[model samples]
Target: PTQKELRDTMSKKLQEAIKHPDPAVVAGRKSAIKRWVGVLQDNFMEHIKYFKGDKLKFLHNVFQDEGCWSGVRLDNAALGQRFTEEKIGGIDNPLRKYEMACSYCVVDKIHPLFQKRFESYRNKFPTETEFGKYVRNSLLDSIKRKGPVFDFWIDRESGELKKYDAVEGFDSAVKFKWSEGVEYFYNHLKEEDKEKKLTEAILALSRVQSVEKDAPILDFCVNKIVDKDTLLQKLSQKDKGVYSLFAELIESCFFDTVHDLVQCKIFSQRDYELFLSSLSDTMLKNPELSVQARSLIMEFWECGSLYQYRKAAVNTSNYTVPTSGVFAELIVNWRREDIYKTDEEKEIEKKEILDMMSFAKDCFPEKFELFKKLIIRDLRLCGREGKRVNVDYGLFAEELFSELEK
Candidate 1:
C-alpha cells in the first residue's frame, strides 16, 4: 500500500479510538500508531534503496527529499491534550523528571483544590504519557503518607486519583495518648485491650531504633519497679519489653545509683542490703550486660559485702553475731616460699583474711570461749601428765590467751 493509504486507514481507526470514553484506550491507540509510523518510515527507506518500479521511482524520490512530509498537514489541537508533540523531551529516556511531576499530576486528577493548582503542569509535560507518569508518581507519594492521618484520605486501593471522605483509623471508639504510647499497656489498659494495642504500640516504637527515643520507656519501668516489685509481673516472662526495659535501666541509672550506695555512709549500711538483694536477683543474672557494666555490678557486690562485714564488726557489742559457717578443708600440700601475687592482690587477700577472723571473733563468742576452755584444759593436762609434750602449743596458747584477756 502507498504511504497515504496506510496513514489514512490507521489515522481513521485512531480517531475513532480517541473518541472513546477511556483516556487509557486513547493513550494506548496513540502510542501504537507512533510505533507503526516508525515501522512505515524504515520499510519505505529500504524499499527505495533496493527496488523502484516506474511510477514508484517518483514516489521513492519524493520520500528521499527532506521536505517530503512537510506538505502533509496534521492538526495538533484536534488530538486534544493527549497528542505527542514534536521534539518531546526524554525521547531516548522516558520517566525522566518522573518523581518531580508525579504528585502534581495525580493531585490534578482527584484533589478538588490541587487540580486547579496543577492546571499549568499539564502543558509543561510533552505528551499524554508524560503527564500520566506524573499521576502515578503522585499517587505513590500519597500512599507513602500512610498512617492515622488528619483530614485528607488518599485511598490505598485506588491510589492517588482516588480519595475517601474519612480516614480508616479515625474511629472515636478508640482512645489513646500518643505521648503515653505502648507504656500504658502494662498498667492502664485491660488485658483484653492490650494484646492488640500492645502490638500496635510496639510496632511504632521498634521502627525507630534510637537509644534516646527508647530510654524513656526503660526509665518508666524503673520508676515502677519498687523494692520487691517487678513492674511487668502480669506480662509474659517471654516479652522483650519486660526484659529490655529492666536491662536498660539497671545497666544505666540503677547501676549508677549502686555506685553511690557502695561509697555512702548511711544508705550503704541501712538500705544497702535491699539494693544488694535486688541487684543479685535481677541485674547480676542478666547475660545481656556488657563486660564493663557486668564488672561494675560484680565489683559493687564485693564492695557491698565488705561494707556489710565492716559495719557488723563496728557494732559487735550491740548484738550476738552468729558464726558464719564451719569450714573443714584440710590442705593436702603446703606452700612456704611465695605465690605470684600483686600488691593490690595481696591487700585484697589480707582484707578478706582479716574480715574472716573478725567475723569469727565477733560472731562466735561462745565457740571462742569453749575453745579457750579446751586450751587451758590441754595445757594443764600436758603439765602434769607430760603426754607427748607438744611444744608448739605453748606459743599458740600465749597468742589465744592474749585475745581471751580482751
Candidate 2:
C-alpha cells in the first residue's frame, strides 16, 4: 500500500472498532488496537525516523483516535509492573525508560524523543487526571524501590508534579516515608558521601511514622559511620538534635561506640571531658537517653579512672587521686609496680599514698581496714621462701600499711 492507502485503511479500521454495536466485539477490537499501539511504540524511534511530515502526522492522528476510541486511561498497576521489571539494558538501565514506555501512548516531533511524555500528553489530550495519578503512583513506587537513582527521578518528577493540583498527599508521604530511600543511599553511598547522607537521613527519619520502623537502618548507618579513631570528633560535629535522634534509634550502639572509644584510649582527655559534658546536656534534655547515658558514665568513671590513673602514675607527674567510690576497690586491686625509683620519686609516692588514704577515708572509710589487711597479706606473702621481695618496697609497703591503719 502507498502511504495514503495505509493511512486510510488504519483510519477506517479504528473508526469501525469504536462504532461496533456489540460491547464484547468493541472490547476485542480495542484490545487489538492497544496491542497495535504497543507495537508502534516498541519500534517508535525507527518508525518516526522513517516517516516524515504528513506521514508522521497520520501516525499521531491514529494515536489520538485510539485514545478517544479506547478512552485510554493510564493503568497504574501496569505502569508499576513495567517500571519494576528489568529492561533490555538490565538492572542498571535508567528508570526513565520504563516510566516513559509505560505511561505514554504516542511520540511527537516537536520535542526531543526521550523527553518526558507527561507534558506532551497533558497538552495534546484530556489526560491531565490520568497523568497526575500515574505520576503520583510512579513516585510512590520509586520510593518503595529505595534506589538512589530512582530517588533523584522522584525528586525531579515530584517537584514538577506538585505544580498540578491533581496530585495530592504526596508531599508529606515523600517527606516522612522516605526512610527506605535513606537506607538505600546509606548502603550504596561512598565514605565521603555518608556523613552528609546520614545527617539528612537522621533529620528525615526523626519525622517518620514510627521511630521503631527506621531504627535498624539508622542504627546500621550510624554504626558504619562511627570509627574508633574519629567517633567522638565526628559526633561532636553533628547538630545537637542528632544526639537525641541517635539516642532514640541506636542508643545501645551509640553507647557501645563510646565505650570502644574510651577503652581504646582513642579519646584524649579533652575529648573525654567534652564528650561527658555533651552527654550530660543530652541526658538532661532527654531522660530516656539518660538510662544508657548513666551506665556509660559509670563505666567511664570505674574503668576510666583506673586507666587514667595508670597513665598518670606511669608518667609520675599528674598522679591525681581517683574521685569515684570505686577508688578503694581499684586501690586494693592495684598490681602495677610503684612508680617511685628515686628519693624524689619516693617522696611523691608517699604523698600519693597519703592522698589516696585520705580520699578513701572521705569517700569509703569502711574500706580502709580492707586496704590494710590486703597490704599486710601481700607483705607476708612476699616473705615466703620462694617469693621474691623488693626489700625497699617491702619497707615502703609496711609504712604504707601503718598509715592505712592510722
Candidate 3:
C-alpha cells in the first residue's frame, strides 16, 4: 500500500467505534501560511477601505480592536466594571439579553468564560464596541457630552460610580488596555507602499485580462477616475477590461465565513477571528487542511470543537443521531464513500467532505438553494445553477482522473 493506502487503512481501522473517523486521504498542496496571510490581509484591508471610503477610514481605526479590523477593545478594569446589578430572570431573560457591550475575551481552557462574564450581563448600561461607537459618535457629534469612557463601572447599591473607568480601571481582569491612538493602524500607507499594493491587486485581478501587463488603475479608470459624466459626456465610450472578479469571490467567502462563524458561536468572536488569521502575526502559518476541490475554502474547526456531541441513542428508527458534530460527521462520512473516492475502490473511502453539505441541502432544500444560489449566480455571476461554487458535481465520465485532485 502507498502512504495514502496506509493512511486510509489506519484511519478506517482506528475509529470503528467512533463515528466519522478521519479519512485516510492525504491533503492537497496548499499555499504556504505567509502567502495565504498576504492574500487575506491585502484583500481584507483593501476591502475595508473600499467599504468605508476615505472619510470613515480614520473613524474605523479610532475604535478598531487590539489586533483586529473592527470593534473596540475594553480592558480588565472596564470588563469588571460592566457588571452592575443582578436582576430577576437573570440568564433566562429574553435576549437572555446580556448587553453585548465592552470588550470580549478568551480566558484559556480552565476558565469557564460564560460563567465568569455572567455578571456583566446584569448591568443596565450596555455598550457594543462596534455598533456603539457608530451610534454614540453620530449622536454626540456636536454635544458637550464626552464620549462614554471606555472604563465605565455601574453601581450595585448607590447611584454614584465608585470605580473610575478609563485607560486604567480595576485590576481583576488583565493588564491589557484598549489603547487609543491614530498611529500603528494606518489606512494610508506611504506613497510607494500604496502604489506597490494597488499594482499587485491589479495584477492578481487582471491576470486573466490585458496582456499589456503594465496597465495601471489609471489606464483602467480613465473614465471613472476623471469623471464619467464629465470626461465621456461628449465621447460616449466605455473603458475596457481592468477589474477582476477572482479576488472578489475570495473576499466574499472570507466575509461570508466571518459572519457565518460568528453566528456559529462555537467560540468567542475574537477567538474565531484569531483562528481565521494566520497562526501567527509573523508567519501566518496554518494547520494541515481537510480535503477539497473548490475555488476557495474556509474551515470551521472552532465550530466543530465547540459543538462536539456524541450520539447517545442507537442508530435505530425514531431515535436519530445527536444534533451536533456527530450528526454532521455521520452524514459527511457516509457521503465520502459515495462521492470522493476512486472508482477502482469506489465502494470504500472518499465521501466525507461534502457529505454534510449535501445533507444540509437535502434536509433544507430551500435554504441550501438560497445560499448556494447567492454565491453562484450573484457572486460569481454564473449563468446557471449547475455551475455554482459549493454545490459539488460528481466526477465527469471522461474527467475522472482522481477525486481529490480536482
lDDT of 2 at 401: 57
- Rank the models by TM-score, top first: 2, 1, 3
Q: Which candidate has the highest TM-score of all?
A: 2
TM-scores of all predicted structures? 0.22, 0.27, 0.18
Clash counts per candidate, in order, are 3, 0, 8
Candidates ranked by lDDT, best first?
Answer: 2, 1, 3
Tens-place lDDT per residue, model 1, 7-83, is 43443343332333544333333333332222223311221223223333333232223231211111212221111
lDDT by residue (tens digit), candidate 2, 1-406: 4544454345344434343455443433433343332222221222233444454444344433433342322232333333333442222323344333323311121123223444444355457556776765554464335322232333344433222121122222224333333443344456676665555554455431434334434544455555533444444444443344444433222454455545653234534333444444433323323345545555554574556633332121222222221232122212223221346633553554456555455554555555444444444443322123554334445566576556
lDDT of 3: 0.26
Give the number of the best model, judged by lDDT: 2
The C-alpha stretches of model 3 lying farther than 4 A from their native spots are: 1-305, 308-353, 382-406
Winner on TM-score between 1 and 3 is 1
In order, candidate lDDTs are 0.33, 0.39, 0.26
TM-score of 1: 0.22
